Amino acid sequence: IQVNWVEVQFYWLDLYGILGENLDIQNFLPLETSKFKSLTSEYKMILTIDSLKMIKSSLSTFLERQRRQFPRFYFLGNDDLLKIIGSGKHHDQVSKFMKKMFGSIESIIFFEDSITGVRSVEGEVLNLNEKIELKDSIQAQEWLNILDTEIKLSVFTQFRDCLGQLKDGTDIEVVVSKYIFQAILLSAQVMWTELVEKCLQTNEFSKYWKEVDMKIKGLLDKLNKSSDNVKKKIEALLVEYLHFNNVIGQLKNCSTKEEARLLWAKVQKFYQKNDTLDDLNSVFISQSGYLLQYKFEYIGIPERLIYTPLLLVGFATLTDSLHQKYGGCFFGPAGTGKTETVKAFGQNLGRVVVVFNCDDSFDYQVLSRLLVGITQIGAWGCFDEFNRLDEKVLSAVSANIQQIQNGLQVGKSHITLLEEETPLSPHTAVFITLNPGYSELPENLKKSFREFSMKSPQSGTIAEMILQIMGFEDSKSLASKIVHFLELLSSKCSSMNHYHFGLRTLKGVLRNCSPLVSEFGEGEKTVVESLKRVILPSLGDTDELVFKDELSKIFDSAGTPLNSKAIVQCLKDAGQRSGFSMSEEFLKKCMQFYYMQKTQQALILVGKAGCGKTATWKTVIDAMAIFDGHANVVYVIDTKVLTKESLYGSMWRDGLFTSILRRVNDDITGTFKNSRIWVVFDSDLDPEYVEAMNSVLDDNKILTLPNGERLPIPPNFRILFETDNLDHTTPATITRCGLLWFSTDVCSISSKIDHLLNKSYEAELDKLKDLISDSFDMASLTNIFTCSNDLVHILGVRTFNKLETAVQLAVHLISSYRQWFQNLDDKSLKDVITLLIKRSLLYALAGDSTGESQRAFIQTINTYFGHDSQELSDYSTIVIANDKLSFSSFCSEIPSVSLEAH
Amino acid sequence: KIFSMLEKFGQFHWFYGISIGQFLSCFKRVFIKKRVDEILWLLYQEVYCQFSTALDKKFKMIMAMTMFCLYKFDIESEQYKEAVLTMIGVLSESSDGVPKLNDDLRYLWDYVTTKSYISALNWFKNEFFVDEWNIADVVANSENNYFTMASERDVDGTFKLIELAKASKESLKIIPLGSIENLNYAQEEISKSKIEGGWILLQNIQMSLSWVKTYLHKHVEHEKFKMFMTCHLTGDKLPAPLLQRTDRVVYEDIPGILDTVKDLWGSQFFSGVWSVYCTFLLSWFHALITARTRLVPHGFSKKYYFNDCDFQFASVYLENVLATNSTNNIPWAQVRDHIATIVYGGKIDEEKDLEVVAKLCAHVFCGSDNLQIVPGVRIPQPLLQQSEEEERARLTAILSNTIEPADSLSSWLQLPRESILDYERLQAKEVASSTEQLLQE
Amino acid sequence: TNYVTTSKGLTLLPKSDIKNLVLFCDEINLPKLDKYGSQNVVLFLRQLMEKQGFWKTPENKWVTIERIHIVGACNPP
Ligand SMILES: Nc1ncnc2c1ncn2[C@@H]1O[C@H](COP(=O)(O)OP(=O)(O)OP(=O)(O)O)[C@@H](O)[C@H]1O
Ligand SMILES: Nc1ncnc2c1ncn2[C@@H]1O[C@H](COP(=O)(O)OP(=O)(O)O)[C@@H](O)[C@H]1O
Ligand SMILES: [Mg+2]
Ligand SMILES: [Mg+2]
């Protein structure tokens, strides 16, 4: 009962920290507190865990009131919320786990036991308007709400003094290095709206177009020599400065004032109220005549979407839907950018949209829990892929948002959602994205929702603006070339499952173009070479032919080879070290894997069974160790051999991957600080084994455990994958991880035979090796293997994969006669060698076939090895006499048997 | 034979399943009303008159033509059968040939030869079957107290039942469904009306289908008490025992465009003069696009549903545009773009249909000096010195003065006559093909 | 088999010192595919037959196998 006693002790200590230490909270459930006190007294005097669980279940109303004090703390699970509540004086585990309440906010920079600033997930720092005193006796919720109000007012006052600095005439290069991205972004939006309105009061647009052009050039010139977080801020702000340039250029080209008024009404406009006494509600947004309220919530420096006209149309329809308190709905084919449109609309209003990824794993309870949380906070809830739920939970969730929207339209103060009365914030909105064509919105939801079918995004404009931000001098024509090439590839290549030539692939191309500029430069060559590095490995053979043809046709560059002779030499050194032979295709696959692992962390290697995946990545590992002089630590972990509890952990015993990650993170001996650590998942790809580690695959590079631990992953901790099929792999992970495809074996028959012979030798000796290698002549072997390929084999295995037996048996048989090789002639030795090789080829190639086919293959072997060689009879064998070996049959080996009756 | 035909009808759609006892009671109705040839003729008439109202218009025509074919096959000779089969073959474009010649046959020849597909399809109904049953005749001459009524979207028979509220002088209690509060309200009112009587209507039971699986299955001769259930023909499948225990009715949409304009204009109670004019133009545009929607292969590419929510959204947008304009310079391009792109064209995924909506908006919301809105009526712009009530009187007068022509599906909706002729050809072809597939088996 | 620690970390050894061991597996076709089209048993045997060892579940250590053989008889699929 030791585990039960430990659990009772932990529960009693946690509940004492939650309720016993703090007063004026025991008046809600006096019976429950009395029962807890009696249980604590019994535990001190001394299975008692069921009663504590029942008490904590009956204390949900007190927990509900505690969550009602600060609803952001509602977002965490019950266990982690109790962990925070129990630590009422340490002020720990609060700042490390608020990314799930505040969305894009990670940690708190607190000094001298007081709040100084806050740190987002992307790394941006916000300094508060004033410090907040932190004391042990102060409860978590009070200072949490104080910090929330403080950061909102700090964002507001940073916006205000950014507006003051910009209206004073100061340059943007001095203010972009001081305050957060949100403040400078909103100040720029307000100033741009005012300036365009002042220019619309007249008929001139050229001089402010030139001013914002010089501003864009100034941001680029500050960008090219800035720090990483400042680079992120400048890129994110350059997105909207290019948008403002586009808007002003469109307004300048208008023939009449009607077109100018139309285009100005279509785009989003930002206004500030200069007379209201309120602070957070002093800035609104006009779009198509409709008004929306800025929330001044912190967002950080996110991935800013490029403002295409269809994005503004989505903004306009979402504003039109929210003007009359209707829900939002987007539907269409996957890849049109619906969820990102909702997120960009939310973060363009300075607020964070809570995203629910709808799936079969998401049950009714958690969905309704998050829904009542977001309707008691006032946040915006976006349901991604809503059509991925079972009928009962679909109906329940549909009724829930139906009554939420019914309360929102009628202006109800409170809502009886989920059979409890809850506050209904008037700023709560619900959006739904759908992927139909494989259902659709239910009738109750469709009576109070606005469905919008957003089209495929303008890939030309998006690619052009991304290239312009990246500094390419020829951006429009190059982006048109890239999108036309991707369209040609999607129209001409085969309809493979893993092929993806959408906007995600194009943005991956443009992201991978960034490390390559230091060795190729801002030009078409960088685009061509990154396009090769990220598109070529995933295609077949004829698909690579088509890729090369349209690459030489569309793009003007012919693909000059780079300087990589040293790495090729190290590769050949590793190949001759391990016995591998370097064909052109094996070298191609090795270089593709090497270039893919230069940038992408998680690699997938896909091909037929025994096509050469392990040899490819092991040869690359050896070559890189020789090239860099850097250590290797390889953990070959089969995915499907170990179960989910054993691979990661069961609620606490650490799983294998979690244990090795903790061991490499701790680094007690310091060996891992100067080594490259590799995990090879040499098994089938499982959704339940990969989707359990999404947070490792993305840019977060953090492993999340069931108990809540967040383990960092080092940059050299490179994951590999080794499967044979991709029919059970999600398209998200395919696009997330690098993908290498083995369309054809990386060997010849003779090369594999030579490697197997060398491995068997390593596992008169030189004369024997020469005789064995010379007897395996290629001219007869190729013909005899083509002949064996036409046979019928049970459990059909490729003849290539059969080679691992044919060599390994044959030499061993010769090894079995290593004591009978100094007492015979050369002709007898050659006959014995030929007979043993014939027997091994028989029982490796045709050994999985019928007796008649085995005899036919015996005849074929005897004809293809010539009549000069010793004929392998159908029942021949080699026996050992008292002095020398001899050739005989199995007829003399048969012992007569006598059996009794019973 | 008739019951085999009706079973084949019910095999196509879940709403048309017929029970044997229904047919036997229908046969008893023949002797109820007030020699073997007359009994057979009354059998055909009574079966059609009772079981037509549970079928949509296409299946009404298919059923009528199949009963006419069966009766004339038994009664008339072989030459009549060959002639009728040639008419069906040329209607379905399967067999060609002149009839072997009877006024009815030569009138049918005139209908088929002059490409009058609707007249050729309705000739059977006009000639053979005499009595026609509306909603009131179905509800009055039925011993069942529970009625299920189904229809397509963009139409609802509920107001018709409100009309029936004045037919029998009974109060109708309309219950919306979709929420737990509405579910409890519906259960309480059902338990009240099962004792105290009164007509109860349930609006769009479909999204409460699971609750239909829970309550009505456990719930299914009071005075002045009849329960009406309204669902959708295109919705989810209703339970079979619920459908068999309730009398099934199908309600059919109006054939007029001007009636839709008048119906929309009679519900706009207010705003100045320009708001009234914009609401009138919006009612006209909504009626025109909703009339064009029903011609699914030609008027559009798919079957969209522009309900009254789109009208409310567009009216709100026009009110907001007119409110924020003090110079009386209406941005016609702005409202055209927001209506053809965001309000009406938002749900449309195709490009040709979006171009159709854009062209309709450009024709309607052009804001010219005089808007010839159809080939019939031209609307002049409002003057600057008129009251709003005078404007409502003027617009009501100009709606009452105009007359809907017989070719309103072509002139008013701006479609070529060839498209309408091809649509009628496809409709008659599908009717005759279904009837052929019934008759050969 | 016995767990010994002599060289190269842990090692699984046959109880006998001279005779090798053979892992007989009757009807290797009978283990069933999971919901995602894979058999745990044959991948375990592939790990034993190719990598010469296995990863243990409860304390995550690599066991090396040196003289244990694997045979199996099965009907056609
Ligand atoms: N360059 C080469 N020259 C000769 N033989 C080679 C070469 N590359 C690979 N091979 C042979 O290919 C064989 C296939 O084994 P390998 O470890 O590459 O398989 P794999 O790709 O991991 O297969 P699977 O995972 O489907 O079992 C090796 O045993 C090796 O003998
Ligand atoms: N205007 C835009 N600017 C930049 N990227 C965009 C834009 N619109 C869409 N994208 C990109 O398209 C990609 C595909 O979006 P996706 O996640 O498939 O949306 P959904 O799942 O709703 O179809 C996203 O990664 C996004 O980066
Ligand atoms: Mg999405
Ligand atoms: Mg492998």
Chains touching A (at least 3 CB pairs under 8 A) are B, C
CA distance A697 to A719: 9
Angle at B40 (CA atoms; ends B35, B46), nearest 5 degrees: 120
* Contact partners, residue A210, CB within 8 Å, separation at least 6: none
φ, ψ at B365 (rounded to 5°): -90, 30
Distance of CA B49 to the CA centre of its chain: 19
Q: Which residues of A touch B331 (CB under 8 A)?
A: 258, 261-262, 265
CA distance A729 to A497: 10
Tokens of B141: 């001459």
- Chains A, B in contact, 3 or more Cβ pairs below 8 Å: yes
Specify the residue for token string 């005759």: B432
Q: For residue B12, how far is its CA from the centre of ligand 4 (angstroms)?
A: 55
CA distance A571 to A746: 14
Q: Is A187 helix (H, G, I), strand (E, B) or coil?
A: helix
CA distance A878 to A865: 19
Q: Which run of H or E residues covers position A391? A: helix A391-409
Query: Which own/partner pairs from C28-34 qualify as long-range (CB within 8 Å, at least 24 positions apart)?
Result: C28/C72, C28/C73, C28/C74, C29/C74, C29/C75, C29/C77, C30/C74
**A723 and A602 in contact (C-beta within 8 Å)?**
no
CA distance C45 to A382: 46
**Closest ligand to the CA of A465:** 2
Mutate to test the interface with A, among B334, B348, B357 (most CBs of A within 10 A): B334
**Closest ligand to the CA of A386:** 3
CA distance B120 to A437: 38
Q: Which run of H or E residues covers position C21? A: strand C21-26
* Contact partners, residue B264, CB within 8 Å, separation at least 6: B283, B286, B287, B311
Mutation test residue for ligand 2: of A503, A505, A506, the one with most atoms within 8 Å of CB: A503
CA distance B312 to A637: 61
Interface contact flag, A656 C55, Cβ < 8 Å? yes
Q: For residue A667, how far is its CA from the centre of ligand 4 (angstroms)?
A: 29
Residue A727 C-alpha, separation from nearest chain C C-alpha, in angstroms: 10
CA distance A490 to A494: 8
- Taking the alpha carbons at both ends of chain C, their separation in whole angstroms is 32
CB atoms within 10 A of CB A508: 18
**A718 and A604 in contact (C-beta within 8 Å)?**
no
CB atoms within 10 A of CB A760: 18
Q: Which residues of B touch A451 (CB under 8 A)?
A: 346-347
Among protein residues, the one with the nearest Cα to ligand 2's atom 26 is A337
CA distance B131 to B48: 9
Q: Which run of H or E residues covers position A680? A: strand A675-681
**CA quadruple C11, C17, C20, C22: dihedral sign:** negative
CA distance B165 to B103: 44
CA distance A675 to A138: 46
* Alpha-carbon Rg for chain C in angstroms: 14
Distances (CA, A) of A667 to A486, A601, A635, A676: 45, 21, 16, 13
Burial environment of residue C24 by CB neighbours within 10 A (0 to 12, 13 to 18, 19 or more): exposed
CA distance B357 to B349: 12
CA distance B209 to A398: 13
CA distance A283 to A270: 7
CA distance A490 to B305: 34
Chain C interface includes A640 (CB < 8 A): yes
Q: What is the DSSP letter of A418?
A: G
Distances (CA, A) of B238 to B139, B183, B201, B211, B212: 21, 18, 17, 12, 9
**A348 and A311 in contact (C-beta within 8 Å)?**
no
Q: Which residues of A touch C38 (CB under 8 A)?
A: 640, 683-684, 686
Reference A441, options A403, A503, A488, A387; nearest CA is: A387
Bridge partners (DSSP) of residue B148 are B229, B248
Beta strand A649-650 with A327-331 is: unpaired
**A794 and C76 in contact (C-beta within 8 Å)?**
yes
**A633 and A677 in contact (C-beta within 8 Å)?**
yes
Tokens of A553: 């046709």
Q: Starting at the earlier edge strand, list the strands of the sheet with A718-723.
A: A631-636, A675-681, A718-723, A603-607, A738-742
Half-sphere exposure of A277 (CA within 13 A, CB side): 0
Half-sphere exposure of A532 (CA within 13 A, CB side): 23
Distances (CA, A) of B421 to A356, B56, B257, B295: 50, 21, 19, 12
Tokens of A902: 């019973």
Half-sphere exposure of A683 (CA within 13 A, CB side): 27
Alpha helices, H only, A579-652: 584-599, 613-628, 644-647
Reading phi first (left if > 0) and then psi (alpha if -120 to 50, else beta), residue A81 is in alpha
What type of residue sits at position A476?
A: K
Among protein residues, the one with the nearest Cα to ligand 2's atom 1 is A306
φ, ψ at C73 (rounded to 5°): -115, 135
Resolution in units of Å: 3.2
CA distance B61 to B117: 12
- Taking the alpha carbons at both ends of chain B, their separation in whole angstroms is 10
CA distance A58 to A23: 19
**Closest ligand to the CA of A612:** 1
* Contact partners, residue A268, CB within 8 Å, separation at least 6: A285, A286, A287, A312, A315, A348
Q: Which technique was used to obtain these atomic coordinates? A: cryo-EM
Q: Is the CB of A788 under 6 A from ligand 2?
A: no
CA distance A416 to B182: 13
Specify the residue for token string 């090894």: A815
**CA quadruple A323, A327, A333, A334: dihedral sign:** positive
CA distance A73 to A81: 7
Residue A331 C-alpha, separation from nearest chain B C-alpha, in angstroms: 9
Reference A526, options A480, A470, A565, A476; nearest CA is: A470
CB atoms within 10 A of CB A717: 22
**CA quadruple A83, A88, A93, A95: dihedral sign:** positive
- Taking the alpha carbons at both ends of chain A, their separation in whole angstroms is 57
CA distance B413 to A156: 54
Chain A interface includes B179 (CB < 8 A): yes
Tokens of A91: 């002020």
Residue B70 C-alpha, separation from nearest chain A C-alpha, in angstroms: 42
CA distance A638 to A645: 14
| A350 in a labelled binding site | no
Specify the residue for token string 């490259």: A676
Residue C2 C-alpha, separation from nearest chain A C-alpha, in angstroms: 22
Tokens of A759: 């491995």
Residues 56-75 of B with CB under 8 A from A: none
Tokens of A316: 């306009």
Q: Is A887 helix (H, G, I), strand (E, B) or coil?
A: strand
Q: Is the CB of A242 under 6 A from ligand 2?
A: no
| A269 in a labelled binding site | no
* Contact partners, residue A267, CB within 8 Å, separation at least 6: A247, A287, A312
Q: What is the DSSP letter of B205?
A: G
Q: Which residue of A has its CA nearest to B348?
A: A453
Residue A795 C-alpha, separation from nearest chain C C-alpha, in angstroms: 7
Interface contact flag, A320 B178, Cβ < 8 Å? no
Q: Starting at the earlier edge strand, list the strands of the sheet with B146-151.
A: B172-176, B199-203, B227-232, B146-151, B247-250
Chain B interface includes A271 (CB < 8 A): no
CB atoms within 10 A of CB A65: 11
Interface contact flag, A452 B347, Cβ < 8 Å? yes
Reference A757, options A772, A771, A746, A745; nearest CA is: A772
Half-sphere exposure of B89 (CA within 13 A, CB side): 13
**Closest ligand to the CA of A636:** 4
Tokens of A355: 């995203």
Chain C interface includes A50 (CB < 8 A): no
CA distance A131 to A129: 7
What type of residue sits at position A847?
A: G
Reading phi first (left if > 0) and then psi (alpha if -120 to 50, else beta), residue A708 is in left
CA distance A464 to A477: 8
- Chains C, B in contact, 3 or more Cβ pairs below 8 Å: no
Specify the residue for token string 């080594």: A675
Chain A interface includes C32 (CB < 8 A): no
**A450 and A317 in contact (C-beta within 8 Å)?**
yes
Q: For residue A629, how far is its CA from the centre of ligand 2 (angstroms)?
A: 41
* Alpha-carbon Rg for chain A in angstroms: 35
Q: Is A549 helix (H, G, I), strand (E, B) or coil?
A: helix
Q: For residue A618, how far is its CA from the centre of ligand 4 (angstroms)?
A: 11
Q: For residue A745, how far is its CA from the centre of ligand 1 (angstroms)?
A: 9
Angle at A430 (CA atoms; ends A425, A432), nearest 5 degrees: 175
Distance of CA A392 to the CA centre of its chain: 31
Residues counted in chain B? 441
Strand segments (E) across B57-182: 146-151, 172-176
Q: Is the CB of A338 under 6 A from ligand 2?
A: yes
Residues 338-397 of B with CB under 8 A from A: 338, 341-343, 346-349
Q: Which residues of A touch C47 (CB under 8 A)?
A: 638, 641
Residues counted in chain A? 902
CA distance B437 to B169: 46
Chain B interface includes A402 (CB < 8 A): yes
3-state secondary structure A216-280: HHHHHHHHCCCCHHHHHHHHHHHHHHHHHHHHHHHHHCCCCHHHHHHHHHHCCEEEECCCCCCCC
Interface contact flag, A443 B178, Cβ < 8 Å? yes
What type of residue sits at position A690?
A: V
CA distance A7 to A9: 5
Specify the residue for token string 């309120």: A278
What type of residue sits at position B202?
A: L
CA distance B306 to B319: 20
Interface contact flag, B179 A261, Cβ < 8 Å? no
Q: Which residues of B touch A314 (CB under 8 A)?
A: none
Angle at A49 (CA atoms; ends A43, A52), nearest 5 degrees: 85
Angle at B235 (CA atoms; ends B229, B241), nearest 5 degrees: 55
Q: Which run of H or E residues covers position A778? A: helix A778-789
Q: Is the CB of A803 under 6 A from ligand 1?
A: no
Q: Is the CB of A504 under 6 A from ligand 2?
A: yes
Residues counted in chain C? 77
